[PDB]
């Protein structure tokens, strides 16, 4: 579908060098043990990250654009839930989500 091509384009942009300075914490699943975040999976019940969204897009797991958007926003919501708002990862999340939301709002009819 046309809308899922738009989603795939957004995903390509989120993973591109253009945004790499702030997108990189979202490239792969949070490795809680490696980062010393031993409470992460007590707080975040449904982890999400861009490599998982990419795999689901490639396997045509998204029935529509709404399902894709729900995973992307889940990613950002997990970051806002786990991390205090003054932590740098939150400023990075907000910049990346600005990129996402403004382009997602251009979804072709």
């Amino acid at each position: 579908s046309e809308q899922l091509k738009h989603c795939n384009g957004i995903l390509k942009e989120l993973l591109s060098k253009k945004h790499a300075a702030y997108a990189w914490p979202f490239y792969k699943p949070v490795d809680a043990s490696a980062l010393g975040l031993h409470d992460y999976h007590d707080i975040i019940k449904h982890p999400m990250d861009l490599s998982t969204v990419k795999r689901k897009m490639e396997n045509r797991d998204y029935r529509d654009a709404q399902e894709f958007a729900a995973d992307v926003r889940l990613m950002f919501s997990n970051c806002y839930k786990y991390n205090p708002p003054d932590h740098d990862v939150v400023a990075m999340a907000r910049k990346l989500q600005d990129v996402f939301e403004f382009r997602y709002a251009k979804m072709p009819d």
Binding site: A21, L35, Y82
Partner: peptide, 12 residues
Amino acid sequence: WYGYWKVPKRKC
């Protein structure tokens, strides 16, 4: 912003 953490999640 420089691609790594000085302190994970908290400090670039």
